[PDB]
């Protein structure tokens with residue numbers, strides 16, 4: 001199953017959205033207005049909403065089929081929350097996160113690092129960060145094949161941690177049994193034939209496919 | 214001493230720059246043109262310059278005073294190369310990298326993990342990356358004062374690695390003796406004074422100051 005989570009970021013940085021392929025639509029704070037003004041469903045609405053006018057928060061209030069209202073002073077970001085909740089409703093679903101990039105970078109990182117958290121690690125394989133130019137997936141140790149997304153021009157293996165014994169095949173550039181001692185971002189690989197593959201014994205890796213301006 | 218480096222990003226997303234403050238100007242690929250079309254100096258030109266026309270690259274070759282033209286096929290990104298060259302010439306200068314804004318997240322993380330590289334570790338305290346919206350500084354374990362940037366609203370402690378004993382004061386949000394078991398982005402913190410402070414025993418943190426669009 002497919003859930004789309006929409007954060008406050010600007011919708012111009014959004015990926016190509018095809019609503020037929022999403023089953024549940026979550027709004028985070030301003031993503032709610034953003035989903036709505038985009039003529040897209042709004043099933044869940046999450047956050048403190050302290051970035052909206054009363055006239056906007058009522059609009060959201062009247063439309064979402066479910067409003068989770070948080071305090072302003074809490075631990076979790078609105079987004080950790082939306083993910084926690086959407087995962088309750090859809091424990092095996094693919095979480096496509098959106099509007100979480102293109103601006104503040106301390107906020108981008110907080111999103112890039114969501115799989116790191118115990119409550120999410122279990123579903124790192126379903127957590128998916130997207131914007132017009134990038135497309136990020138997560139992987140724990142193992143052996144995988146990565147099918148090329150059509151619109152993306154480049155491939156990258158970003159080790160978010162020290163990685164052990166990393167081998168890449170079926171891609172313009174290779175590593176065999178490479179040790180990655182500190183976070184390294186093997187950055188501008190390219191696909192050779194519709195799919196590449198890699199294996200590694202330890203750490204985490206964000207697989208980023210992307211394309212230019 | 215300060216050195217200023219310019220990647221090929223759109224200059225629209227540049228920080229406000231004051232040139233008096235820099236003693237050396239470094240162009241990176243298409244950033245070489247951005248410097249000249251902004252009536253600023255170009256003293257070091259670096260890259261493979263494949264993004265440039267034959268005519269633009271003729272203009273960058275007459276104007277610069279040192280040209281480093283490198284193979285399109287290398288391990289290093291143009292920016293990795295330019296940084297090492299420039300530190301070769303100014304080993305104690307504070308490197309400010311702007312225009313690293315192209316939008317590709319493999320390159321974003323390529324840049325953000327620079328200090329990790331054994332050839333840059335010895336100067337992490339010297340490396341800065343800046344955006345219209347963002348300003349990034351690196352820290353190894355110690356005790357520090359973090360002077361507020363006048364145009365910025367937010368403060369963030371982005372732990373690039375598991376951090377240990379993270380104490381953090383004079384902020385609008387505190388941690389104290391905090392163990393951070395994996396990468397964690399404590400973002401959207403605020404200054405209460407003109408300076409904040411923090412300390413830690415192990416790992417590496419990227420202090421980030423940011424503001425809204």
Ligand SMILES: Cc1ncc(C[n+]2csc(CCOP(=O)(O)OP(=O)(O)O)c2C)c(N)n1
Pocket residue numbers: 173174175186187188189220221241242260261285287288289290291292293320
């Ligand atoms: C393991 C393997 N991954 C893929 C890389 C691909 N490679 C390393 S960096 C990159 C060069 C890109 O440099 P550039 O984007 O001009 O620099 P920028 O100006 O954006 O700083 C090449 C393709 C290969 N060398 N090694």
Ligand SMILES: [Mg+2]
Pocket residue numbers: 002020021022
């Ligand atoms: Mg379907």
Ligand SMILES: [Mg+2]
Pocket residue numbers: 029047048049050051078
């Ligand atoms: Mg909020």
Ligand SMILES: [Mg+2]
Pocket residue numbers: 048049050051052053054057
């Ligand atoms: Mg409100």
Ligand SMILES: [Mg+2]
Pocket residue numbers: 242260261262263264291
């Ligand atoms: Mg280039």
Ligand SMILES: [Mg+2]
Pocket residue numbers: 287288289
């Ligand atoms: Mg080389």
Ligand SMILES: [Mg+2]
Pocket residue numbers: 380412
């Ligand atoms: Mg202390």
Ligand SMILES: [Mg+2]
Pocket residue numbers: 378379380412413414
């Ligand atoms: Mg301490």
